[PDB]
Amino acid sequence: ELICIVQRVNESFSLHSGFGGNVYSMKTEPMTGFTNVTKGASVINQKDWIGFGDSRTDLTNDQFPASSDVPLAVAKKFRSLSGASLMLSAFGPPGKVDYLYQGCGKEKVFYEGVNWSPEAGIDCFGSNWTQTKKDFYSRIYEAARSSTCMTLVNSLDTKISSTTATAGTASSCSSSWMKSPLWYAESSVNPPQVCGTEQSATFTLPTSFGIYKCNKHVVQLCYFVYENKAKFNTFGCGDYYQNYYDGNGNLIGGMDNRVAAYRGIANAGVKIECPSKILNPGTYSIKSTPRFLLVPKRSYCFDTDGGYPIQVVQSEWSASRRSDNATEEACLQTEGCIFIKKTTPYVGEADDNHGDIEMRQLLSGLGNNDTVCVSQSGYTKGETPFVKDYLSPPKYGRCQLKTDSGRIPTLPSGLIIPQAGTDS
Amino acid sequence: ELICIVQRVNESFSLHSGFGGNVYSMKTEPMTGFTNVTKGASVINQKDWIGFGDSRTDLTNDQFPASSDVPLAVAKKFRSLSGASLMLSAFGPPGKVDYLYQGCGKEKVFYEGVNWSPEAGIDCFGSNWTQTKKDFYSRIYEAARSSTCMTLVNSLDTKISSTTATAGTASSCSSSWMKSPLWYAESSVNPPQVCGTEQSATFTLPTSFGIYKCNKHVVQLCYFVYENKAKFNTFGCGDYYQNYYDGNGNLIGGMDNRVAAYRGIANAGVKIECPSKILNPGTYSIKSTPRFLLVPKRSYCFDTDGGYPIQVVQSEWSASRRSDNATEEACLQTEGCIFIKKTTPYVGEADDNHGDIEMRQLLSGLGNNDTVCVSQSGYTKGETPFVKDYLSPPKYGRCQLKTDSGRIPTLPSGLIIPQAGTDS
Amino acid sequence: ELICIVQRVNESFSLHSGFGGNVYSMKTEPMTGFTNVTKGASVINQKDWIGFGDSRTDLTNDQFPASSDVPLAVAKKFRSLSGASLMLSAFGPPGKVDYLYQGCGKEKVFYEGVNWSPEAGIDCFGSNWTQTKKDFYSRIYEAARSSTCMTLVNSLDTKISSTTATAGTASSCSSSWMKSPLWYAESSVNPPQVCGTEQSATFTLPTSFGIYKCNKHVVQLCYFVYENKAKFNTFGCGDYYQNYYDGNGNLIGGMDNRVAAYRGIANAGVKIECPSKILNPGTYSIKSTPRFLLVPKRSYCFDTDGGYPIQVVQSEWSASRRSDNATEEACLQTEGCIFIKKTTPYVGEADDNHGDIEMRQLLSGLGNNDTVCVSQSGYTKGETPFVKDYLSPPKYGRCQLKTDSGRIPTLPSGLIIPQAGTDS
Amino acid sequence: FGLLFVGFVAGGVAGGYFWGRSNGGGGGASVSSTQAGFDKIGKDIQQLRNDTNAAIEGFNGRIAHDEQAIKNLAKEIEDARAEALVGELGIIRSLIVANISMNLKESLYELANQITKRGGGIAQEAGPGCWYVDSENCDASCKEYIFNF
Amino acid sequence: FGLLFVGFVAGGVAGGYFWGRSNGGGGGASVSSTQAGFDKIGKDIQQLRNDTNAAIEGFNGRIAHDEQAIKNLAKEIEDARAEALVGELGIIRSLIVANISMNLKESLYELANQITKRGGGIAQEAGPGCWYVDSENCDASCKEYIFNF
Amino acid sequence: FGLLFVGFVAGGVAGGYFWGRSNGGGGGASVSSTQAGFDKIGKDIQQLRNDTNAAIEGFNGRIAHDEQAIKNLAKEIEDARAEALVGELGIIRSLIVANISMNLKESLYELANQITKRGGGIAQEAGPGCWYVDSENCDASCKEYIFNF
Ligand SMILES: *[C@@H]1O[C@H](CO)[C@@H](O[C@@H]2O[C@H](CO)[C@@H](O)[C@H](O)[C@H]2NC(C)=O)[C@H](O)[C@H]1NC(C)=O
Ligand SMILES: *[C@@H]1O[C@H](CO)[C@@H](O[C@@H]2O[C@H](CO)[C@@H](O)[C@H](O)[C@H]2NC(C)=O)[C@H](O)[C@H]1NC(C)=O
Ligand SMILES: *[C@@H]1O[C@H](CO)[C@@H](O[C@@H]2O[C@H](CO)[C@@H](O)[C@H](O)[C@H]2NC(C)=O)[C@H](O)[C@H]1NC(C)=O
Ligand SMILES: *[C@@H]1O[C@H](CO)[C@@H](O[C@@H]2O[C@H](CO)[C@@H](O)[C@H](O)[C@H]2NC(C)=O)[C@H](O)[C@H]1NC(C)=O
Ligand SMILES: *[C@@H]1O[C@H](CO)[C@@H](O[C@@H]2O[C@H](CO)[C@@H](O)[C@H](O)[C@H]2NC(C)=O)[C@H](O)[C@H]1NC(C)=O
Ligand SMILES: *[C@@H]1O[C@H](CO)[C@@H](O[C@@H]2O[C@H](CO)[C@@H](O)[C@H](O)[C@H]2NC(C)=O)[C@H](O)[C@H]1NC(C)=O
Ligand SMILES: CC(=O)NC[C@H](O)[C@H](O)[C@@H]1O[C@@](O)(C(=O)O)C[C@H](O)[C@H]1NC(C)=O
Ligand SMILES: CC(=O)NC[C@H](O)[C@H](O)[C@@H]1O[C@@](O)(C(=O)O)C[C@H](O)[C@H]1NC(C)=O
Ligand SMILES: CC(=O)NC[C@H](O)[C@H](O)[C@@H]1O[C@@](O)(C(=O)O)C[C@H](O)[C@H]1NC(C)=O
Ligand SMILES: CC(=O)NC[C@H](O)[C@H](O)[C@@H]1O[C@@](O)(C(=O)O)C[C@H](O)[C@H]1NC(C)=O
Ligand SMILES: CC(=O)NC[C@H](O)[C@H](O)[C@@H]1O[C@@](O)(C(=O)O)C[C@H](O)[C@H]1NC(C)=O
Ligand SMILES: CC(=O)NC[C@H](O)[C@H](O)[C@@H]1O[C@@](O)(C(=O)O)C[C@H](O)[C@H]1NC(C)=O
């Protein structure tokens, strides 16, 4: 009696081709799946990263950890002071906090700026600080994607030719002025029979700052705005002008009226525009209309040694106070930047303004020893190479790839019969 | 009696190594081969593409499909009018056709321009329209590789300071003038005892046009050319000049004689050069020598939202009429552009000028539901990853790769004997 | 009696998983290892490369091969002359050697320049030739990464308006002057009652040179430096100035005092700065302060047709003579360049200055038929895809990749037992 | 018909490995039992698919490093990249499969020797899974000792 | 000498699978027939190489998305890319081959059981392709029934 | 217990392929000799690992063309690239291994037929490596002729 072991399958059994024969089975398990994604900030390398911050990241703050959106372990990785902002420290308005930011880290978190919103009610002839703000922070983010480190340069080398000149003050600027720019005036210039001599000035973007090296510098080439010639002439004579050339004499910024029209809002009187250019280190020259002079005095110093895309985090107040989203749109219109945004408003644990639950869980990624990618869509670990949806740029790291679930191959399971040969 | 089945091969049998034993056989079939390539235009995605065109793509044309180089199904995908060109609609010369091109498509076919060749015999003091033409179409192609959409902006916001001034006319320009640029004159300026006041003007490149968004704008900063100072002084006084600065006052284009020499061809008298710069949206300022003023009035509006390489198609007349290849060399000297060229002349089916067989078979790719790559060498389907020759850039899509035929691996066939083990 | 062949392993036997069963064995051999790296220069393709050189590469030299750092087979691939440099041939100082370099090669070796060091003691009012030197050679290296060929353009088309003018001479410049720039003077200008008329000049960067095509040109826009206005006024009047605009009139280089400060070292008297800009081909305009005029007369002509990263080789003297490393730091601060540096000083075989052992073994790679990659770390063959350490950029070719030795997989050896199935 | 081949069935009917018998007094009409306790199997199937992970853990661990600084997604790029990677994966799948398919069918060949070596050479290898036992010198609880059914 | 090994031949002489015989009255000089109608084979060889396409269709369908905007060809780039891709392909080839080589030689092992199970256990598996038949209890059209030659 | 399985040992004790014997007068306690001169083996092991190179020479010959003009190393890029390449290599390894593992164990199956075809059908295939020889019709230098031990 011939006695076999016959193999056999149903209309519920399915074949699976291999390179080396094939296989039978009723069910399969997928080989891989997607990798969860977490909203917010995080970092792929914990010992090369730096945050710059404010009260919300300050541990010296008399109210920590209720006033903080981060744990301490994390708060140690920030260069914060309560009430600071990068902007204020670029200008040092009268009676503000003047923290010399300086850190070095490839991944960079920026979580400040609220400490100069409209609420700061800083005047000082500010044309539209929220504008100044946006253009400022952009050049910052523009320069911090390509830099390792950053430091405030809290005093620039400067000189004026005019020796009679004196320094400014405004009812509008708490009866003094900015730390930068510097403002110089001529008492004698009298539009009505005297118009004085043109003032010169020069200034030097240094090649280093202490241990920090300067390839590129973020400054403000500041000029005055007037409604018109007639408006201005009630002070000066002819056109207003204020101009910045380099060592060769090519013109970089400023506001020379003798070639372009006036643009000062009606009856707004005098204002100041403070657009931020990025300049190499070096000595730059200044020519102004005789009675007044303006001079850049601080800067932000960056290297060209390389950086990861940065993480800019939403820094507004609570509903009650007047904020703005000037660093959001700055992050948006700038390459290699990444915004972090709350879906709700800020609801503080110590103040109304300090200690948001959403933020704490947002910034909690900062956090972990095992983030592997960091995209505009949030951040992942390294479970699989795939994501259910695209990881939105800017991103860096071992970033996954959106594939459709129907393409993820599968592997046999449950009851399994081999196969081999034509069997015929 | 031991009774076997012995396997055995000849000097006509060849072995084939596998990872898992090897194989014997007298012949082989290649695993893959090359993929044919078709000259001409085509598109990889039929529902995201736009053509801009002329009579040769116009279906309203009283003579379609004899006057057309495309089928209708295809002609529906163009924004054409009989006798239009992008250039004319940038200038609107007197008695020309003035079609407001606007489409949005990633792949973009450009098949027009012949309706302004020398044959158009447009004068209007044109220095060398064929030059103007080339520099025009380049900035267009330069901006359309990086844009999704495009629209003619057929009226720009403008203002003059001088109020006595009046608008131009030329025997040479059908006794009127361009739609753009706009031309303003001073009756009183008399070189010989009067020289009048400098005219100012301003203009605004808008941030959008209807549904179309403007990141970048293609304009003409137009100026006058004179043989020399003496020539000019018979009108104006000192040097001629005409200058364009931005909102900050940096100079972009124009022709200021007071810093550079004159260059007007001998006894050519006055001419106009119309070079095309790409400018961001915004308000730009103008200073001119008192008697005359010029002002840009139209533009081409593009987004920065992204584009595929474009396909520029040879748009000349038939032998009998005077054409030029100004859009060929414009396509050649510009990144991400692709030219489409006939090997013969144009031989029309309705006219001499409308209905070429070569063109119809060239543009027939536009056409298909299954083009997968589109290179300067023409276009392929997705048979194989290889091509006999290189697919010449610019290209996009699942583009094949030239490998030598001798490297394409092969697979056994005909009589086949396995192998396994040292057999010893 | 059941009689088997049992397989069996020890605590010294290790398993090896395959896709198709596994394997046993006491030892393994690695599948691959690293590829040695050789310091110095070499080339991946012997028939497309060009060196430009000096006595050290010259075979006509009455002392070859003792005066040479290369073999002859290699020396044939250079465009050298004893005592030449690219710099001198850009200026042709009085009584120097004036070799018209011209070669075409993708890989490019530059091994010259020592023949203008401080030792050359060239005066001619040189502000800081070592500066001039660095900025020169940079624009050269900047333009030679992107070019196939290069030729000296030893005479540029030029014209002056002033007809009274005459040509310069200096006690300091061997009682004549540079070949370039050209120097023009006004006898009559007398600061003290005469100040003469402004001189104009123009010049043309050609679109080709003989068989060599010019997309880009390396020139010197040369100007004078003075300690101050008072210093200068003892010659000229008001400010000094000297300016370069293009055909449109945009300003490229020069030194106009009327907008930027003076910067001439104390009591240094007059000097010359010779910074090198890269300009397209075309006609460029010049305006100078009346008494003097300067004009560019030579150039280096490059194509945009493409190039490999270049190889710049350390060209100093021996200890005894005064050299500099101006082409080292030029190579360093410029993209796609590669420096080649000796660890010892130069110790010549014919002279002290000609025939270094270290160099000969450095440049011996030039050399071989089988270099496959060429990095800032030296050069490899094609043994393996890996290197023990990173191959430092700039690099090109089939460049290896540093992996850790512990990751290089291995393959069984010595006694080997198969395996298959759960065996249970 | 016994271990190199797989048959089918209709309607109801289970599937798998069973136990069958052939002829008799010339000629027979066959007779198929209802599976043996073939539990060595299910231990190994459980072993094997628990091994695959080695390669699966390998494929999972490899995600390449990238860096875009650009604000808008590179979608064809994304999906070319995703298509290449799913491509590579398809291969891997195909190999685990063969790595079982071979190794499963290499241990179905490591059970049918247990059967050919207990009652031997009574068995008389009709190859694998199948054998030739005469009802002359081996009978009924000589056949419940060996086949286990 | 019978299915795990392949021999050669010179001059003329065809190649393939044949039919051979060994000894006799002690001792023999061998005798090789001229192939059987072995048609199950050629059906399967035809089956198999018609399957390969599955993987070949797979390799064909994968062309990566690229976009250059540049007017001059990137030729080393082109050919590095082409070399990588031909590289990947070489592997695939090597696997189809093994996938046949194994599966062909797995069905030459699904024909020689048909031969070892007709006249059995007269056959007496001298392994595969080869067997031990005595001229005592199996003769001449018992041997044209079984081997088919 | 004979060629599909591998056993272990402790303390001292060599490893490899040997020669064993089973029962006797009912029942036996086994007896294992000290390897045969199994030299066909070591010729083939030497053959085989000398073949691998074909694929190893293939993997070695493929280094992709690159060009950076940048002065500072792209280290994540470098190592993503290096990780991809070591990745690809891991696969290749895994296949040479199977390519031996299969081909080694396919020639351990091309030695145990030499053994099953000399004294036959005295041998009586207890599969491979193992066989059934009666002490009735085959004895002692009939057993030094066949097994070579
Ligand atoms: C390896 O070869 C086997 C056998 O030739 C292939 O198996 C075939 O697979 C198709 C599905 O693609 C089935 O429809 C056939 O019935 C199978 N035939 C046999 C005889 O099994 C298998 O496709 C190949 N492996 C791969 C990865 O392609
Ligand atoms: C898998 O292993 C087999 C056997 O070791 C290799 O087959 C050898 O291939 C070479 C050609 O490269 C022939 O010259 C030899 O005669 C073959 N030997 C045997 C015993 O078949 C085969 O090369 C390996 N597979 C791959 C893809 O390299
Ligand atoms: C192919 O399958 C075999 C058998 O299932 C795998 O072998 C196992 O490998 C692990 C190590 O990863 C060992 O610890 C087990 O003992 C092995 N089991 C057996 C039964 O051999 C092998 O890993 C698979 N191949 C690959 C490349 O993963
Ligand atoms: C084919 O056979 C399998 C088993 O031989 C059937 O699977 C059984 O399905 C029942 C429910 O109907 C489950 O409770 C059992 O767990 C399964 N048994 C095994 C051994 O897996 C399958 O339903 C059959 N298909 C058809 C169409 O009859
Ligand atoms: C080796 O053997 C094969 C066949 O066994 C020979 O191939 C035959 O070639 C003839 C012509 O000479 C063809 O008509 C047949 O179609 C082939 N037969 C088969 C079965 O394929 C081959 O010519 C032989 N080589 C040598 C050198 O003798
Ligand atoms: C396991 O067995 C192997 C061999 O069967 C042992 O390897 C031998 O080691 C000796 C030295 O102790 C060498 O001189 C021989 O060359 C080896 N023999 C062979 C055949 O390779 C190994 O030492 C054993 N391991 C243990 C722990 O006993
Ligand atoms: C420099 C300094 O004292 N900064 C105060 C900082 O804003 C601080 O966070 C808050 O200061 C306040 O005046 C404020 O409402 O802003 C009172 C808040 O209680 C205080 N909050 C905290 C958390 O410190
Ligand atoms: C930009 C400009 O012309 N500012 C003038 C400035 O407002 C003005 O001179 C200042 O007027 C003030 O009422 C003021 O506080 O603004 C009093 C200031 O002392 C006075 N400052 C000066 C420098 O004159
Ligand atoms: C606006 C308008 O009427 N354009 C005419 C357009 O050129 C048209 O294609 C051709 O017009 C002509 O005058 C010409 O020779 O150009 C007569 C041609 O028959 C006509 N051809 C066609 C196909 O319309
Ligand atoms: C560029 C320039 O100076 N153009 C002057 C222009 O040719 C000239 O004033 C025009 O001369 C004409 O003969 C002509 O048709 O060209 C008559 C025009 O009315 C006249 N136009 C004006 C604005 O004066
Ligand atoms: C144009 C010319 O005669 N150049 C001489 C060149 O420098 C030459 O290499 C060296 O010239 C010298 O005056 C020198 O010390 O520089 C004498 C050296 O012996 C001579 N050396 C050699 C190798 O030619
Ligand atoms: C840059 C500048 O103003 N140079 C003036 C130049 O040194 C001066 O005019 C020259 O003075 C000299 O003593 C000299 O050799 O330098 C005599 C020269 O003939 C004289 N050259 C001229 C052109 O006047």
Numbering used by the authors:
A (entry chain A), B (entry chain A), C (entry chain A): 3 to 193, 197 to 429
D (entry chain B), E (entry chain B), F (entry chain B): 9 to 157
What did the article's authors report about this structure?
ICV, however, has only one major surface glycoprotein, the hemagglutinin-esterase-fusion (HEF) protein, which possesses all-in-one of receptor binding, receptor destroying and membrane fusion activities. To further evaluate the infectivity and transmissibility of IDV, we expressed and purified the ectodomain of D/OK HEF, and determined that it also uses 9-O-Acetyl-Sia as its receptor by glycan microarray. We also solved the crystal structure of D/OK HEF, both in its native state (resolution of 2.4 Å) and in complex with its receptor analogue (resolution of 3.1 Å), and the structure of the enzymatically inactive HEF (resolution of 2.4 Å) alone and in complex with two receptor analogs respectively (both resolutions of 2.2 Å). Indeed, our results show that IDV HEF is functionally and structurally similar to ICV HEF, but with some distinct characteristics.
The covalent modification of active site serine by arsenic was first reported by Ian Wilson’s group in 2003, when they solved the structure of an acetyl esterase, HerE, and its complex with the inhibitor dimethylarsinic acid, and illustrated the mechanism of the broad scope inhibition of serine hydrolases by As(V)-containing organic compounds. The active-site architecture of the HEF sialate-9-O-acetylesterase is fully conserved in ICV and IDV HEF with S57, D356 and H359 creating a catalytic triad and with the side chain of N117 and the NH groups of S57 and G85 forming an oxyanion hole. The esterase pocket of IDV HEF is highly conserved among ICV and nidovirus HE proteins and could represent a potential drug target for developing broad-spectrum inhibitors.
